[PDB]
């Protein structure tokens, strides 16, 4: 009988408030109740079941003394009750109890332990997302509690990192001197070496735990989304707190201490990164106030990048995403002085294995956007550093072809900046332009030799589509970049030259570089032979056909010719006298 089963569970819930019942009996009863919520929710009595159980659960949670030992049966019962409340479906039957549950949880946030506070925060998030209740005073009290935590954070940091305390041996410390769930072992009788042995786990206070601080900002963002018109002035107070939080750094001496905890530092860095994500969300709304404090923000996030642990790849990913969002705003100008550090790959990506494999595309894409927006303000040295980094990216076969194309396009855009800055500095801009041209020639050689050979090997007579489209895009970008670099070289004053002249015969080494460019690019432009049929077949088109049907091939070949037609006639003559036998052989193999 389903009715009898529900009455049995109701009796179990009533027995939860009983004082005579043993704790383990209550734990077993509630474990049975948790497993059987699938059956209860089906019957229409589930509404009356809720009306009976929810007040009883809230009453039991309110009456109980806040426990801080994880092995205590009372703590486990409290956690199971909270998880049961969380598991309760969020249909319209939960609506009448929603106000009471939210008030009870908001009261527990101030006083209960980490495990319970985290569960209560999850419950609050779920209830506010599903039901969206109107604004109450408890919401403002929560915002004040969050601000108080932000102000208390330096004291927490000092207590745990800066001045660690040695827990007395064989004793149970108070929760206010542990930073995370710590397991300790106690011998009952200290008078002898042999005695009864008991073990305990201490849960930190929710007002001091950094995991709660990490979980807070998403709740603030959610409540700002729901209550945008009401708490707009209240959220403005968080901005200086956010900047101070991201500015905080653990001293080098503290990290080298004998009592240093790596997991607690990881949690602290996670909290700082979550705070930076909160800032990146509110950066566009409070941009004037954020701008007033930005000078500390640049330092703080540079330090977050330096200090992010190598093992925590997810934190590095979230940090990079938050940085990408922030840099889109005007604040990217503040980074102009400090970008010489931001090009350090150890700073940007770190030494982690997962970070190095996965997150390099995100890191270089963010840095590329920053450089592209900032490029007109960067000095010659910073432009050279960016060129060196993205040139190293061009050759790197671990990166996806999209990132290589993006780096080629970045260097293309940098070319005119490098020209202008070299003309102002009278510096070595022509040398870095020549180095970029050499990198592009080596890229044509690599595509001709390795990539195109594999593409042809994969063809058959009439993700491979992706490889063909990215090869085409990379070859097109390489041709455009070679044309732009050639325009830059022919428009730069040379180092130590007296005066510029409107065209100049290139030196023999440059002519050799362009000869290699002809040789390699004529092989690389064979990618356009490989067609992509609708059946999934990739086939090489008939060799003897000069009637190109694609406009992209015509445009890229005309631009390839545009590279050489802007050169001094003697240079053109020297290059093509040598190359023409090969050019004719390539035309024979590829009539396009």
């Amino acid at each position: 009988d389903q009715t009898t089963l529900m009455k049995k569970y109701l009796q179990f819930v009533a027995a939860l408030t009983d004082v005579n019942t043993p704790d383990e009996t209550k734990l077993k009863m509630m474990q049975e109740v948790s497993e059987n919520f699938e059956n209860v929710t089906s019957s229409p009595q589930y509404s009356t079941f809720l009306e009976h159980i929810i007040p009883r659960f809230l009453t039991f949670l309110q009456d109980g003394e806040v426990q801080f030992l994880q092995e205590k049966p009372a703590q486990q019962l409290r956690k199971l009750v909270l998880e049961i409340i969380h598991r309760i479906p969020t249909n319209e039957h939960l609506r009448p109890h929603t106000k009471n549950v939210l008030s009870v949880m908001f009261r527990f946030l101030e006083t209960e332990n980490e495990e319970n506070v985290l569960i209560c925060l999850r419950i609050i998030i779920e209830l506010h997302k599903q039901f969206r209740p109107p604004i109450t005073q408890e919401i403002h009290h929560f915002l004040d509690f969050v601000k108080q935590i932000y102000k208390e954070l330096p004291k927490v940091v000092n207590r745990y990192f800066e001045n660690p305390q040695v827990i007395p041996e064989n004793t149970v410390p108070p929760p206010e001197m542990v930073g995370m769930i710590t397991t300790i072992a106690v011998k009952v009788n200290p008078e002898r070496e042999d005695s009864e042995t008991r073990t305990h786990s201490i849960i930190p206070r929710g007002s001091l735990s950094l995991k709660v601080l990490a979980e807070l900002p998403i709740i603030v963002v959610l409540m700002y989304q729901l209550y945008k018109l009401n708490i707009h002035n209240v959220v403005a107070e968080f901005v200086p707190l956010i900047m101070n939080t991201i500015a905080i750094q653990v001293s080098a001496q503290a990290r080298q201490h004998k009592l240093y905890n790596k997991e607690l530092y990881a949690d602290f860095i996670a909290a700082q990164i979550k705070t930076l994500s909160f800032l990146a969300y509110i950066i566009r709304i409070y941009q004037e106030l954020v701008t007033k404090y930005s000078q500390q923000m640049v330092k703080g996030m540079l330090q977050l990048l330096s200090n992010c642990p190598a093992e925590t790849a997810h934190l590095r990913k979230e940090l990079l995403i938050a940085a990408k969002h922030i840099l889109t705003t005007e604040l990217r100008n503040q980074f102009i002085p400090c970008m010489d550090k931001l090009f350090d790959e150890s700073i940007l990506i770190g030494s982690g294995y997962t970070a190095r494999e996965t997150l390099r595309p995100l890191a270089y894409s963010t840095l590329a956007d920053l450089v592209h927006h900032v490029r007109q303000h960067l000095p010659l040295s910073d432009l050279s550093l960016a060129v060196q980094l993205f040139a190293k990216n061009i050759d790197d076969e671990s990166l996806p072809s999209s990132i290589q194309t993006m780096s080629c396009k970045l260097l293309l855009n940098l070319v005119d900046c490098i020209r202008s800055k070299s003309e102002q500095e009278s510096g070595n801009g022509r040398d870095v332009l020549m180095r970029m041209l050499e990198v592009f020639v080596l890229k044509f050689h690599t595509i001709a030799r390795y990539q195109l050979s594999a593409i042809f090997k994969k063809c058959k007579p009439q993700k491979q589509t992706f490889q063909v489209t990215d090869c085409r895009s990379l070859v097109k970008t390489l041709v455009c970049g070679v044309k732009t670099i050639t325009w830059g070289i022919t428009s730069c004053k040379a180092p130590g030259e007296a005066q510029f002249i409107p065209n100049k015969q290139l030196q023999p080494k440059e002519t050799q570089i362009y000869i290699k460019l002809v040789k390699y690019a004529m092989q690389a432009l064979d990618i356009y032979q490989v067609q992509i049929a609708g059946n999934g077949q990739t086939y090489i088109r008939v060799a003897n056909c000069q009637t190109v049907r694609m406009k992209e091939e015509k445009e890229v070949l005309e631009h390839f010719a545009g590279v050489f037609t802007m050169m001094n006639p003697l240079t053109f003559k020297e290059i093509f006298q040598t190359t023409v036998p090969y050019m004719v052989e390539r035309i024979s193999k590829n009539y396009a």
Partner: protein, 666 residues
Amino acid sequence: RDVLAANPNRFITLLLPSTSTMRLDLQFQAIKIISIIVKNDDSWLASQHSLVSQLRRVWVSENFQERHRKENMAATNWKEPKLLAYCLLNYCKRNYGDIELLFQLLRAFTGRFLCNMTFLKEYMEEEIPKNYSIAQKRALFFRFVDFNDPNFGDELKAKVLQHILNPAFLYSFEKGEGEQLLGPPNPEGDNPESITSVFITKVLDPEKQADMLDSLRIYLLQYATLLVEHAPHHIHDNNKNRNSKLRRLMTFAWPCLLSKACVDPACKYSGHLLLAHIIAKFAIHKKIVLQVFHSLLKAHAMEARAIVRQAMAILTPAVPARMEDGHQMLTHWTRKIIVEEGHTVPQLVHILHLIVQHFKVYYPVRHHLVQHMVSAMQRLGFTPSVTIEQRRLAVDLSEVVIKWELQRIKDQQSLLAKPIDKQHTDTVVNFLIRVACQVNDNTPGEVLSRRCVNLLKTALRPDMWPKSELKLQWFDKLLMTVEQPNQVNYGNICTGLEVLSFLLTVLQSPAILSSFKPLQRGIAACMTCGNTKVLRAVHSLLSRLMSIFPTEPSTSSVASKYEELECLYAAVGKVIYEGLTNYEKATNANPSQLFGTLMILKSACSNNPSYIDRLISVFMRSLQKMVREHLNPSGTSELVMLSLELVKTRLAVMSMEMRKNFIQAI
């Protein structure tokens, strides 16, 4: 070149012992000359031992690697490491015994030089497995074991395992030379000739584990995975009562199961992959298998998705094969994680991806999972702001349920053979219809729509789920959007009309009549819009419907003998009449105005040639106007052909003047 090669001692003076700038230029010139000689004479450098020793000295020197890693972009010497590596590689090609110099070439991969070092990687991954003998591979491994060089850090050993040892041993195992390469299958770990024994004892030594870099640990776990998969006999003989080597290998893996919060995820899950392979190969106790399974289930993080997927693909088939109640444990833990968690979306989508990938394994426990699967499918498909990947996952779950019913049909041609509960089929069909009609984009989801349509066509068959329920009322809202000209998803309308025509072929006639009654307003609304695609779709729908139920003849007062068709057929007749009358009235209009009218009329006459007898005069005058516009000016030809095909058999209805005009005039 012969003159230069006759005095190698000249180069030793140029290899390095504002003046320092000259010495580095001389070193670069020396290395370039040596590279040219090596290119032109492949066998020369293999004998010049002192020259190669000084080249090695330069290559391993700290200043050289620092200077080339920390170059200025304008540095002239950027080619230098490529040429020096090429020379050292040429020496190593003929002198296999110099394993130390071969390992020092991997310093090219620790940095990021601005020169393409692909030739070194190609040589190490391809040629070494092909060319080196079994004895030489054993020498490689035993040199890696006892490589006590202070300047050869853990990252360089990781490079060794990644590029040299693992490919060579993989090739050897693939060829079948594992017995010779590993040597004796020593159960007791002492024998220094047993590759697995020395690996597990010396390399996996717990004292070393402390400072272990993550890359070195990862590639050590990959090497151990090779050893376990290709050569389980050497790791553990099942006949032996106890083996220490298996225990020590698991102990090396075991730190990954620890619940620490700051571990690189790739290392942890690579250790889980090694444990999964060990569990598959060897009869491991239940508690270890269940702990590994539970920890992989909780692995919903994006960072290590691929390794977790590999580990689960290895382990999930193994669980039923390992223990006598493997299916029950699979059910228990999958249900537990889906229920007690899943308030966070990524965990639920991870478990559902695992269910989709291994649906064949879960088949004997289908009945338990299916309820949670359909509930999560609906939730993921209808929660606000579904990402296209999440909607694809929901469609994948629906496809999993359909494939389970295909397997049930195959098996039937007893709790494991009993059919799925009908209500789950109903909700899967309805979710498929709704997602197919919704997912099309207003301007890609089209592919998911087509996949859902095909999946629905397979779901509704004479064997799969005939006479399923349907929830069509929502179509009323969808088709009414056609009325609103501001923004409407025409693709959604077309997909819905196609689904409706399929339902007309699927459903029984009384069910068609009962279900289509609310649709009447929506179908009638479609016939008005100017979009040709919607007109063609509604034309096909009406053609099928009117083929099932022909319009009334004789100009009877009722538009249909069926009340469920009465309003739709009245709207069809009214729109045909109004379109023909408007085209007659129009002072100047393109035939394209007729297009929808003509398609609807053609549908109305598909199974009732007499239908045009109502409209014969106005239709004939419209045909005259069409022919006149065509003769004295692309769809006009199609409309003229359609009109001619309509009246070609209605000569007896037309008046004598109209008949004469049609035959001798049009």
